[PDB]
Design a protein around this ligand. Structure first.
Ligand SMILES: NC(=O)C1=CN([C@@H]2O[C@H](COP(=O)(O)OP(=O)(O)OC[C@H]3O[C@@H](n4cnc5c(N)ncnc54)[C@H](OP(=O)(O)O)[C@@H]3O)[C@@H](O)[C@H]2O)C=CC1
Ligand SMILES: NC(=O)C1=CN([C@@H]2O[C@H](COP(=O)(O)OP(=O)(O)OC[C@H]3O[C@@H](n4cnc5c(N)ncnc54)[C@H](OP(=O)(O)O)[C@@H]3O)[C@@H](O)[C@H]2O)C=CC1
Ligand SMILES: O=C[C@@H](O)COP(=O)(O)O
Ligand SMILES: O=P(O)(O)OC[C@@H](O)CO
Lengths: 312, 312
């Protein structure tokens, strides 16, 4: 009946594809580079997944996608558009895994998909660090959108629980913006771990996020579930979070741009915050935390002056 | 208007000192003449590291006056036996303690109403005493009588007080977050299951809110500093005693020997029992609290408990 074409072989694309493959689903994983395809197919390893055998089949050919495929998007948001534009056919639907907002257009992934493919859309999002999912540690996420019931059945495992909801916009916005807050949370860790401060930041942060989402018609309840508060918590408080780590290193004195070029992994919040600021200015929505993360990341604002400013 | 701070543990001592350092008239009562003399003579306390305590200490409840603000900072199971010994009734109580009395099933507000019968406010939020002593950014909420006035006197540049109307919600949120934090700590003792913890905390805030709304709490309270904020700092911070307790039980230590190993009080250990009685009497379902009770009081293996809670 059905096949998953997983687009993007980073940490999460690879782990998700492998999980689906282990569920007994028909899966193929697309990787950008032939070297990654080769490592997966030949040596059943990926540099994106530590100590985990990768047995799912990889390809470098987009021409392998079929009109009956479920396209799973696991490409970092700023690179989704160029890759969808090169698909030789439209898939039967899109399941999005990526968290962010496209900088130039202010578009959520659903909207990019709508513009380019126009096929049914769903989004999976929750507290799900790929490192822990690969180790089969208990994880729960939410799924919103079309065909969510069937998708729930095929994706779920013993350790990976999928709850469905109806608020696509809310799920997309919560997952995108929690990375921005997490940067701000890492800064506090970079100061030494100011736990009272972080929890207060997280509290005000979920609220800032909910205000942005509700302005685009999200449901307030979405922000109090796994896609909102859950994901925010796992991201602000885990050693596995790239966004929290990015903030932590900025606080330690590392140059933000240099940090970005130091990894092959993407820090989505560094990009989303710029998209969020453009939207906020155009629609006159106040985003205090996002505005400070923007200043620290892009305008070289001293993290400590940022901290003090945000307090008043 | 004088603050009479009843109880010289970690938080009574720090709160008392902070008010004193901000120019308020304060006196601190300590149960033991040894602690009183350390504070008055050596300007130190074993409940507050590397920090000079200059606030005046007394061992005499006779020093309280009808014009005082009675600030309660005695762990909840021991408040009553001390309030019964007050020679006079204070103008009001500000309560700092987080829990529910086992003997009766009563909140601190209901203990104060029964024994003293004066006005009441509660201060609660993400405020680990260790960090407040170090003057690190901290935010809490205050509900109840004279909150506006108390806000003006208590607030510092690093200790921010927000007021709200919901005394019941604030008390239940602060009492019960400690029960969820034992559960959260257990996941740290298995090795750190971050995705699971986040899912636990998302379910946990909802279990807390359900219990509170049964007693006429406001839903919004649980999404603020008293609710999610305090839950987050307690589940995730190295300073949490309740998180540490759970971590140590997951590592195989005996719950009672853990409690006896320290002069500090693990309020969640006692609050869970009071919760269970209330829940059984009122047919309120409390999945997480129930498993915490079983692990702490009934020797239930933490891994079996984890497995069972997942089936709920
Ligand atoms: N724990 C996690 O890692 C989680 C991630 N997510 C989300 O999944 C999405 C994908 O990120 P994730 O899987 O972590 O990716 P990683 O951070 O692990 O790696 C970044 C990926 O971007 C790829 N890429 C594709 N096209 C380009 C290009 N044009 N320029 C630069 N890089 C490109 C890289 O490929 P190459 O190897 O060829 O450089 C690599 O696969 C993100 O939106 C993320 O937020 C969601 C949940 C969990
Ligand atoms: N970071 C923190 O510690 C925070 C604590 N809280 C709350 O403050 C309240 C007070 O706890 P905290 O300051 O932490 O106390 P600690 O855990 O630091 O110490 C325990 C206290 O219990 C005292 N105690 C007083 N009377 C009795 C008695 N009747 N029988 C047995 N022990 C007694 C001990 O006195 P002695 O020294 O004589 O043994 C000691 O002062 C709690 O409800 C707690 O939840 C709130 C915010 C921050
Ligand atoms: O705000 C956190 C305080 O209640 C301290 O928590 P704890 O008793 O678990 O140390
Ligand atoms: O590593 P991060 O900060 O990209 O976070 C991964 C998350 O999306 C987990 O929910």
């Amino acid at each position: 009946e059905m096949r998953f074409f997983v687009l993007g072989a980073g940490s999460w694309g690879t782990v998700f594809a492998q999980m689906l493959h282990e569920n007994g689903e028909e899966v193929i994983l697309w990787a950008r580079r032939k070297e990654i395809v080769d490592l997966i197919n030949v040596s059943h390893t990926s540099p994106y997944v530590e100590e985990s055998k990768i047995t799912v089949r990889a390809t470098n050919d987009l021409e392998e996608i079929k009109k009956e495929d479920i396209l799973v998007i696991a490409i970092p948001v700023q690179y989704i558009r160029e890759h969808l534009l090169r698909l030789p056919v439209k898939p039967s639907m899109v399941l999005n895994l990526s968290k962010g907002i496209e900088i130039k257009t202010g578009k959520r992934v659903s909207e990019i998909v709508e513009e380019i493919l126009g096929c049914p859309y769903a989004v999976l999002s929750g507290p799900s660090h790929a490192e822990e999912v690969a180790k089969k540690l208990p994880t729960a996420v939410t799924l919103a959108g079309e065909n969510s019931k069937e998708l729930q059945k095929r994706i779920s495992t013993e350790y990976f629980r999928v709850y469905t909801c109806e608020d696509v916009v809310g799920v997309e916005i919560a997952g995108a913006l929690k990375n921005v807050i997490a940067i701000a949370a890492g800064i506090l860790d970079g100061f030494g771990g100011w736990d009272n401060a972080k929890a207060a930041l997280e509290t005000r942060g979920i609220y800032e996020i909910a205000r942005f989402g509700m302005f685009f018609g999200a449901d307030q309840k979405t922000f109090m579930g796994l896609a909102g508060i859950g994901d925010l918590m796992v991201t602000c408080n885990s050693r596995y979070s790239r966004n929290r780590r990015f903030g932590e290193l900025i606080a330690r004195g590392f140059n933000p741009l240099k940090l970005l070029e130091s990894s092959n992994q993407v820090v989505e919040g560094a990009f989303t915050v710029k998209a969020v600021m453009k939207i906020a200015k155009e629609n006159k929505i106040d985003m205090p935390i996002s505005e400070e993360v923007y200043r620290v990341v892009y305008e070289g604002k001293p993290p400590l002056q940022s901290m003090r400013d945000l307090m008043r």
